[PDB]
């Protein structure tokens, strides 16, 4: 688009970062992340630890799971596996449970810091409606 609808200065900083990455890098990962950052909140549904673990169950382990949303803890999930989760915002319970399980909680700026092209990444979205 032309301008982010959000009023968060840090979200606009992320928008500038991913505009630069999309323009100077051929990464479809960067392009889709930029579009999802431009997206509104209801178009960015929250993801759950149960969902990300169910997607992580297979050989996709040791891949950095990437979701542009709020990662919410799920009481139904009893055991949380080790994982590296990078998201816009983490709820306190979700972050605490990930850290207790031994995973790594990351921000999107450090995501671009480590792997600008989204190598070894696993993109997830939330449930629609």
Question: Which positions touch other proteins (CB under 8 A)?
Answer: 7-14, 16-17, 20-21, 24-26, 75, 88-90, 92-93, 95, 102, 104, 107-110, 112-117, 119-120
> By CB under 7 A, is residue 2 in contact with RNA?
no
CA distances from 17 to 47, 72, 100, 108 (A): 23, 25, 31, 10
Matching residue, tokens 């799920």: 74
Q: Which does 18 bind (CB under 5 to 8 A by kind): RNA, other proteins, none?
A: none
Coil, strand or helix at 73: coil
- Please give the Cα distance from 34 to 18 (Å, whole number): 6
Residues 60-79 that bind RNA (CB under 7 A): 60, 63, 70, 72-75
Contact pick of 14, 17, 34, 46 for RNA (by CB under 7 A): 46
Under the binding rule (CB under 7 A), the answer on residue 32 touching RNA is yes
Site size with RNA, rule: CB under 7 A: 44
- Name the minimum Å distance from CB 10 to RNA: 9
- Binding status of residue 117 toward RNA by CB under 7 A: yes
**What b-and-e string marks burial along 52-81, b requiring 16 or more CB atoms within 10 Å of the CB?**
bbebbeeeeeebbbbbbbbbbbbeebeebe
């Amino acid at each position: 688009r032309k301008a982010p609808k959000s009023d968060n200065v840090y979200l606009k900083l992320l928008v500038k970062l991913y505009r630069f990455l999309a323009r100077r890098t051929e990464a479809p990962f960067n392009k889709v992340v930029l579009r999802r950052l431009f997206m509104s909140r209801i178009n960015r549904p929250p993801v759950s630890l149960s969902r990300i673990a169910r997607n992580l169950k297979n050989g996709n382990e040791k891949k950095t799971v990437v979701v542009v949303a709020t990662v919410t803890d799920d009481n139904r999930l009893l055991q949380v596996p080790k994982m590296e989760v990078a998201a816009l915002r983490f709820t306190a319970k979700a972050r605490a449970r990930i850290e207790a399980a031994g995973g790594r909680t990351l921000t999107l700026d450090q995501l671009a810091l480590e792997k600008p092209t989204g190598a070894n990444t696993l993109l997830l979205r939330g449930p629609k409606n």
